[PDB]
Every structure is written in C-alpha cells, then in structure tokens.
Structure 1
Amino acid sequence: CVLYDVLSIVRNPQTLQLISKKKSLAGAAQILLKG
C-alpha cells in the first residue's frame, strides 16, 4: 500500500554500509557455524 501510494503521488563519518556489511558477515558466519 505504501509503495502504491508513493507511486501514485509521484505521478560523513557514518559508515552505515560498513556496519551493515559487518552484521551480514557475522550472520553468515553464525549460519555456517550452525550448519
């Protein structure tokens, strides 16, 4: 509903991506350990 509403209406030192990649790597390592 939010996507459809948006479609109808349209007509520095943060490193958030680094933290997200670190969390993804940690999750992948945890999944491998669980396997």
Structure 2
Amino acid sequence: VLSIVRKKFMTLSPQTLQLISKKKSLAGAAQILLK
C-alpha cells in the first residue's frame, strides 16, 4: 500500500495507554526474569 502511494495519495479519554503498557511490559518481563 505504501509503495502504491509512493499512484494517487491525498489527505483525509484518560486511558493512558503508554502509562499502563509500561507497567504491563515491566511485569511481563520481570515474571520471566524471576522464573
């Protein structure tokens, strides 16, 4: 799709995704590390 666009192109909530994902990945890696 990018190579085709490289044909005809055009221009057209307190979730805190990164804040929770950091702790999630930290816990996930720490689990395997401790194991």
TM range (shorter): 0.5 to 0.7
Long gaps (5+) in structure 1: 1-5
CA RMSD of aligned residues (A): 1.5
Q: How many residues align?
A: 29
Instruction: Give the number of the structure whose residues are more often helix, by fraction.
Output: 1
TM-score (norm 1): 0.54
Larger Rg: 2
User: Which consecutive aligned stretches of 4+ in structure 1 deviate over 4 angstroms post-superposition?
Assistant: none
In the superposition, the TM-score normalised over structure 2's length comes to 0.54
Q: Mind listing any 5+ residue stretches in structure 2 that lack a counterpart?
A: 7-12
